[PDB]
Amino acid sequence: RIRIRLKAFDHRLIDQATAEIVETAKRTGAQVRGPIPLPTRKERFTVLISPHVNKDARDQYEIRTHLRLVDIVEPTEKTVDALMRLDLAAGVDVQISL
Amino acid sequence: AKQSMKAREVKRVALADKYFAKRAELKAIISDVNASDEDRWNAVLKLQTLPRDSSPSRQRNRCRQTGRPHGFLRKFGLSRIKVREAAMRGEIPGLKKASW
């Protein structure tokens, strides 16, 4: 039972990552549960934009971290190895749970 | 922002990791619940006779670029002005202007 838990900031980028993972795994012998959209984490920073006074002048930024779960059940060794040989993109962070 | 202060913070970090490896060991004698009274009093004094820098309550977490004490954020490790500059320039990944 291998679960591929992968995070990214850009959601159009993380669609592509889980797409290549589900395609390569579902190619040769795996009954995966597919992409699971675990909730996006919105992290908000309020910063002051003046170098001095004017406390009321402020900017609110956010980092949105998108989670995607892929659940391989009935695994195969060439599926997990040909999954490992992919180096999809910079911007996605993968964690394979054995 | 006074290069001597950046030198002071980098002096404190260098003492901090080393005598923090020593300090977490020697600080456990004072307050476990039941070590002794002799070694409690001994550990108090030997904890005192370390340099004051190498206590991690003495660092300020200054900014990396300007070295500014106030307005710090721990996520980026910068001050607020340099976070705004790097966010507008696009240097920080995934940081959009939030509106909701």
Place this chain on the structure above:
Amino acid sequence: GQKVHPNGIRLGIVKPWNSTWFANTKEFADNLDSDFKVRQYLTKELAKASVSRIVIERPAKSIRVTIHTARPGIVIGKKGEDVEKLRKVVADIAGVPAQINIAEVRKPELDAKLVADSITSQLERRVMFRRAMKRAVQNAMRLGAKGIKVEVSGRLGGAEIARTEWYREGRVPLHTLRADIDYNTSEAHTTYGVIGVKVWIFKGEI
């Protein structure tokens, strides 16, 4: 206080980021500081060599630095050899080993960092500022651009009272979020002080 940064909002809407990676709460400040160090180290050595921007990716515990330069043969030098020297500092100053690519700039009179470098270079050569602005504006509009606005602020001739002065030709719609506008500022340090050049270039709508 006016005028939010154009790239800073089209980061979300249109323009791509300059950094493309992911980090947890631990690795974020270290990655960000290493990226700042490699940008400020490449900045001078290719600020003689007409650079515009570098894009840092962090794939698989390594750093990947794309350099968008207007003179690629000056960056690569003889046989690409100078780029290897860049690798043997960046793979040092990033920690992780380096892979440095050079992306070309097709028309260097449409990339705003290069135009700000041009006007600041001319202003440090003590030319008249209006000659530099009108030459850059006419060059961009005659090479084909939907709009350009240059703006210089500072003492601007050698002058006790400092003023701003700008030129637009074409349309520069800053409120249109679906518009493609690239903007950069640079600083010209002359003997009277600092003169700041902000240039906006509108290329079309996305």
Place this chain on the structure above:
Amino acid sequence: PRRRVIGQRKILPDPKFGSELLAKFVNILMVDGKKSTAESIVYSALETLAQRSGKSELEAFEVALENVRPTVEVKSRRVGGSTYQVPVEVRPVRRNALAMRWIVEAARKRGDKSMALRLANELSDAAENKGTAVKKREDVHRMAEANKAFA
């Protein structure tokens, strides 16, 4: 406001015995965002009211509300700049609301053991024309009668 003639909101009809007037009275009575405690005060006022009248609670509320009710009021207006007090006729949806407001603001005084007993006193004293609500009404009617020259 300045421009619009914006339409009024709709309040919920009453749970116990349906009336928009009773719901408006509860809404005028409640302070600090507490609808339930004011509803309980109104109900334990109107349950100890219909026994001291014999006429039941909605009708005792209606003609106890009638004796404190304005038909003209005083506004301030300018013609030349002297800025004096003029009489003007009132709206019916304004006059019932001004009645409820006068009853509750007179019932905040005459302190008794609880607010429900205070409403039980002041609804009855207004039903028999000697409360402070009808005294405020008689003040308004006297003041708008004394200035009757301005039409």
Place this chain on the structure above:
Amino acid sequence: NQYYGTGRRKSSAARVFIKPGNGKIVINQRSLEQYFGRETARMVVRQPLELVDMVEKLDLYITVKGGGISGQAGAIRHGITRALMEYDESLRSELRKAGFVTRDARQVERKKVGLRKARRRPQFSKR
């Protein structure tokens, strides 16, 4: 069988299953009286069943998350409206003329920057 309605109101989410039966109402393994005790949802969950006189011939199974008491009450009412809309398309025409069909959205306003609680400015003083 089962006719489903969903009702959201003020961050409350209710899901209602209406069926032919008794007058008994079940809500999170509880009755109506032991879940809501005050004026609201002893009345407002009765209102779409009070417009068309069918309180006795149908029974409900309601499960609800989110919000508070009156928000959950309006969520259940808006869900019972959809659940009774699953009965007959003439019912929505008969109860469109009294409310109950609109989602009644009106979420809380986010706290604005510089202000105190999204409208209240903090105490301007000239000198």
Place this chain on the structure above:
Amino acid sequence: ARIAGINIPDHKHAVIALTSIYGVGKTRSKAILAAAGIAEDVKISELSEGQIDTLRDEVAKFVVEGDLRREISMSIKRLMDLGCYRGLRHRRGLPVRGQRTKTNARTRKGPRKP
């Protein structure tokens, strides 16, 4: 109805009437009435005299009104005759626990005439 220092009220409950003594508050009166076994609800007027004496000795266990006033005045005088910092703050009529002295402290500094 007569606990050696003072008199207690008779129409209050026994907890609240016990709190009239200098030296007991809510918790100490609760503990005293829990030891003596009187319910907290009943008034003083329903109590009887043997039960008032079995209240009296438990109030006599603690330090109460007279020697408590002696103890407090002796400690504050000990501070003021010590020469410590809290002694000087007790002297000049200023806040002792490090409070704001610039703006507030209108309890310790007295009502504001000037």
Place this chain on the structure above:
Amino acid sequence: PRSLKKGPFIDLHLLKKVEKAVESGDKKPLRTWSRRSTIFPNMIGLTIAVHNGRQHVPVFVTDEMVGHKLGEFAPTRTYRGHA
């Protein structure tokens, strides 16, 4: 206040100084920059000149001073009156 399980606080240099003054047996003052040190019972009867920021004020350790810090008997801010 400190915790009770930690014990009372004194500097090591002040403890060495007061034990040197006990084995020496003299009653000559000693000037200290250790305001954060709790007064110990062996220090009773010898004047200690505690630093207050400018000068060293000499305080005489009595029996009643045996709980407090040394700096509590050395005022730092001077104030006489606004008139």
Place this chain on the structure above:
RNA sequence: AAGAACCUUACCUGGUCUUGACAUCCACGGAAGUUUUCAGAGAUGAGAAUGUGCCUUCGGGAACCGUGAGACAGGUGCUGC
């Protein structure tokens, strides 16, 4: 100032250092580094041991640190008119 017990800290009293706490250069050496003591409020001042590594022109070269001169370094010092 999105947070003054020390730090922060720019302020004051006292004790100290000068190519300097932060950089580059030049000459001479010493592995760096670790433990521990005494004096001192501490900065510092004095030691006593331990280790001696990498490529090798291997009298050397990279980090490290000490000493000496001069360019210099440093200034939260002034003018946001």
Place this chain on the structure above:
RNA sequence: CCGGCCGGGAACUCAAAGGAGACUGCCAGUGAUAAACUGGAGGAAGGUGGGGAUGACGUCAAGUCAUCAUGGCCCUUACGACCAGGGCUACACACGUGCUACAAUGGCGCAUACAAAGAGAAGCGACCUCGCGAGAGCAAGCGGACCUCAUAAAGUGCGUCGUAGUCCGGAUUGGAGUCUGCAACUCGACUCCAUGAAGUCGGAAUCGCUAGUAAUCGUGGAUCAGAAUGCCACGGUGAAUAC
């Protein structure tokens, strides 16, 4: 063992990607054959649906040379640098902005219900034991829709106080502590016991608010070793009035 607890289900809440929708699109009336307005239908939504981001040319020679950068002056055994202690926390007074109150729409005690958003690795720290409590001990889980912070509070039901400076208020002060931290005197937060001040709705004046708003109730985060009544966010209940 009735606990989504387990098989299982892919309906529903939800999660996130992708679309549809709202455009004066339709109808009537009035207007210059117009733009538009007024009303109505359907529609979850009605006319920029609500909110945010978005700040034109310029004004104040507005603010910052103490975030940074910088032209010019000034200092160089000193205005540079290191350290300990102090101070930034003082206190006859004046103002600005907030918090808590003056109570019965309330205080206290008991029982019970309903949230959203967020943080967590030299960190969040279950269960159990000890302590009146702050907390201590031992200690699983968790880089998290899993685990923890973390029992939401107003509300509700019963009792009690019966309008007193009072069972209101909780300042001040004494004693005893806990925890972080080399170190809590100057000068931390909290706990428990005792104390129980002013204050009974506030002068001339003056502020905010047009609907899920004002008001009221709690929660969370950043900075942070420790230290919010501030700031930034989040939900519960929830008005009145506009001629």
